[PDB]
Amino acid sequence: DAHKSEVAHRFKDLGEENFKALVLIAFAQYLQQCPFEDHVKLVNEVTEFAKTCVADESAENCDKSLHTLFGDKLCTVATLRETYGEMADCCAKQEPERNECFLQHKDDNPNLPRLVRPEVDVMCTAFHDNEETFLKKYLYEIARRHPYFYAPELLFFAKRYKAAFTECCQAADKAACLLPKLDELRDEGKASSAKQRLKCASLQKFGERAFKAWAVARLSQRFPKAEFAEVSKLVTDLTKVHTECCHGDLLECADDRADLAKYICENQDSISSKLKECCEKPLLEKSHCIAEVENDEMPADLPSLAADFVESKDVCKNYAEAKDVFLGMFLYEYARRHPDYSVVLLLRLAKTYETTLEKCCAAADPHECYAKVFDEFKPLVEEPQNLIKQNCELFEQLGEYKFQNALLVRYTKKVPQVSTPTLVEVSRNLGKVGSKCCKHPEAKRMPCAEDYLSVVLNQLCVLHEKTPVSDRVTKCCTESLVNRRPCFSALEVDETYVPKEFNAETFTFHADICTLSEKERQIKKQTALVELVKHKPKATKEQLKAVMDDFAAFVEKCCKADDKETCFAEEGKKLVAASQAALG
Ligand SMILES: c1ccc(CN(Cc2ccccn2)Cc2cccc(-c3ccccn3)n2)nc1
Ligand SMILES: CCCCCCCCCCCCCCCC(=O)O
Ligand SMILES: CCCCCCCCCCCCCCCC(=O)O
Ligand SMILES: CCCCCCCCCCCCCCCC(=O)O
Ligand SMILES: CCCCCCCCCCCCCCCC(=O)O
Ligand SMILES: CCCCCCCCCCCCCCCC(=O)O
Ligand SMILES: CCCCCCCCCCCCCCCC(=O)O
Ligand SMILES: CCCCCCCCCCCCCCCC(=O)O
Ligand SMILES: [Cl-]
Ligand SMILES: [Cl-]
Ligand SMILES: [Cl-]
Ligand SMILES: [Cl-]
Ligand SMILES: [Cl-]
Ligand SMILES: [Cl-]
Ligand SMILES: [Cl-]
Ligand SMILES: [Cl-]
Ligand SMILES: [Cl-]
Ligand SMILES: [Cl-]
Ligand SMILES: [Cl-]
Ligand SMILES: [Cl-]
Ligand SMILES: [Cl-]
Ligand SMILES: [Cl-]
Ligand SMILES: [Cl-]
Ligand SMILES: [Cl-]
Ligand SMILES: [Fe+3]
Ligand SMILES: [Fe+3]
Ligand SMILES: [Fe+3]
Ligand SMILES: [Fe+3]
Ligand SMILES: [Fe+3]
């Protein structure tokens, strides 16, 4: 029906190197606790066998589906019963139940130590002696910690990491080049892991119609020179894709992804003209590239949306004829015109239209009833543009670090009850969001913000369901996609909070504060700022500036000083004592 040998088709399709790396990521995600060692033979054997099928597709065993091959290898591991336990009982089953059985014993978050990043001298020296082992061991370590991370995407990050190593490992200050590049693409790797978990939960926590409206909006921004009927074809295929990808089967998700890229690339002309570099790329990178394509230009003279949606007499019956399709046509016309909008803003608008149409298409004079609906959109539009305008001018006046401290005070007062490391991690993340996004002009600021906020805001919510501390954070995390952010933006100062018991040790500073990296230094300052607010919640902004002003003096005096360890302990007891009286 399909190819005679699946393994051969994919070996020639991918190439040996991509095949080897991808086979290893798959077994790494399924047998996370086995030594690096075991996987390298497993991949070698899988790769020896695949080559025999490239030579002869009618050779031994080459006609079994890759799924069969995959489980067959998993069950040859002899430690499977002792190390994986009930995961070995899946071998008692036959296909297709066996694969579906291995599928649900993938361990979302297993118990592995956090990888400690060795020094730049020792990384570069290791990358030289054995490039292969260095890069593949780290692929194994990351895949065993991220079992649901799409394998092709993990391979793309590994190739970027390799690029950093090949370039920065032959420089004068290797660390000056390597470290920012590993921080950038580790935060990127953490941000992409979060997008993947968010979308899958979004699928089911808000509904398919909410999801389907999301993708209608997004696809209309990306492809404005395309018909609503092409867009809604693509929305439907994409929902199939995401549904089997979130389910977890790598092969099933990758086939579905490739077929969609092949379709998109055949029907380029009716879709978008920004699409020729991705379609000349190999099968593996095709959908990767199409996923990240720039928005096509909007058709030049587009009419006002008020004809089809306000002034036409037929709106109320075209709507009631097929309510959702009409709302999706509203959504597509509004979106193709506004790639400067966040998707969720466009969903607020379509939902506001919708709420106005059920009210107004019951009236006698509906056109009279809804002639101010388009007026209604504009404060919805104004709200996020303005808190962006406001927060990017703050960032511009304070620089990243001082802006992050502004946010620390803001969110500690809003939600005092949160752990102080978490307050620091999130206010540090938001400041990086402002650094990334405020470098766009206004026309691209709102998509940027939603792109990064939605992962920060979801990582915050998965953390909260685990260790709950605030009902007002539970509220916002359980609301509709469209109300998630405006809920957070509406959190006010907890005026029911009781100040924290003052603890002396938490505001004393030893001699290490000088000998620390620029990062760690800031972290310990920010940790104390939080605990200062947690103890002085009704401190004013000016009082706080005095307390942090005198503190900053206190470090610069007892760090240029010939005796460090004793100016800190004495000029600090005075600071703690002066601060307690300045506040209160
Ligand atoms: C890792 C992380 C993020 C991305 C997203 N990519 C979109 C893109 C646009 C055109 C062609 C391929 N990828 C942007 C980008 C930046 C740097 C490298 C690559 C890349 C290189 C090879 C394969 C896949 N990606 N990609 N890719 C890999
Ligand atoms: C702590 C950083 C260690 C150095 C990086 C190792 C370079 C090769 C790694 C291959 C796969 C990398 C995928 C990382 C994604 C993530 O950070 O979640
Ligand atoms: C024992 C064999 C198991 C491994 C089988 C090889 C499968 C390689 C991974 C398939 C994805 C390749 C195409 C990517 C699809 C896409 O996202 O465009
Ligand atoms: C990783 C995105 C899905 C897989 C790629 C299949 C073909 C490209 C799809 C382009 C859609 C661009 C918008 C982002 C996807 C979304 O709406 O969630
Ligand atoms: C066939 C495409 C579907 C189009 C549906 C358009 C509906 C517009 C209303 C916006 C809904 C987004 C918010 C979801 C709220 C919810 O379902 O709880
Ligand atoms: C400008 C980004 C960094 C700012 C850090 C804290 C303030 C975040 C609020 C700004 C963006 C809000 C709009 C997001 C998308 C939407 O809800 O439509
Ligand atoms: C478990 C973690 C709890 C963290 C909750 C504290 C709130 C931190 C800030 C998140 C809201 C940011 C989005 C809107 C920005 C704004 O208007 O301030
Ligand atoms: C009740 C008061 C207790 C004593 C408080 C002592 C001072 C704590 C200061 C911690 C905030 C650090 C501010 C960093 C700003 C900067 O780097 O200039
Ligand atoms: Cl093919
Ligand atoms: Cl060399
Ligand atoms: Cl050499
Ligand atoms: Cl990092
Ligand atoms: Cl996650
Ligand atoms: Cl999403
Ligand atoms: Cl699989
Ligand atoms: Cl490229
Ligand atoms: Cl009229
Ligand atoms: Cl219609
Ligand atoms: Cl407009
Ligand atoms: Cl625009
Ligand atoms: Cl009118
Ligand atoms: Cl917490
Ligand atoms: Cl602006
Ligand atoms: Cl977070
Ligand atoms: Fe060499
Ligand atoms: Fe890429
Ligand atoms: Fe009129
Ligand atoms: Fe959001
Ligand atoms: Fe001490």
UniProtKB/Swiss-Prot annotation:
Coiled-coil annotated spans: none
Mutagenesis / variant outcome for changing R114G: In Yanomama-2
Disulfide bonds: C53-C62, C75-C91, C90-C101, C124-C169, C168-C177, C200-C246, C245-C253, C265-C279, C278-C289, C316-C361, C360-C369, C392-C438, C437-C448, C461-C477, C476-C487, C514-C559, C558-C567
SUPFAM superfamilies assigned: Serum albumin-like
Effect of E354K: In Hiroshima-1
UniProt modified residues of type N6-succinyllysine: K205, K436, K519, K564
Reported effect, D563N: In Fukuoka-1/Paris-2
Annotated residues for binding of (4Z,15Z)-bilirubin IXalpha: K240
Binding-site residues for Ca(2+) 2, renumbered to this chain: D13, D255, D259
Record site feature (Not glycated), residues: 4, 20, 41, 64, 73, 93, 106, 136, 159, 174, 181, 190, 195, 205, 212, 240, 262, 274, 286, 359, 372, 389, 402, 414, 432, 436, 466, 475, 500, 519, 524, 538, 541, 557, 560, 564, 574
Effect of E570K: In Osaka-2/Phnom Phen/albumin B/Verona
Tissues where this protein is expressed: Plasma.
Site (Aspirin-acetylated lysine): K199
Pfam families cross-referenced by the UniProt entry: Serum_albumin
Top-level division of the source organism's lineage: Eukaryota
Residues involved in Zn(2+) binding: H67, H247, D249
GO molecular function: antioxidant activity; copper ion binding; DNA binding; enterobactin binding; exogenous protein binding; fatty acid binding; identical protein binding; protein-folding chaperone binding
Subcellular location field: Secreted
Modified residues (N6-methyllysine): K534
Name assigned to this protein: Albumin
Record lineage: Eukaryota, Metazoa, Chordata, Craniata, Vertebrata
Gene: ALB
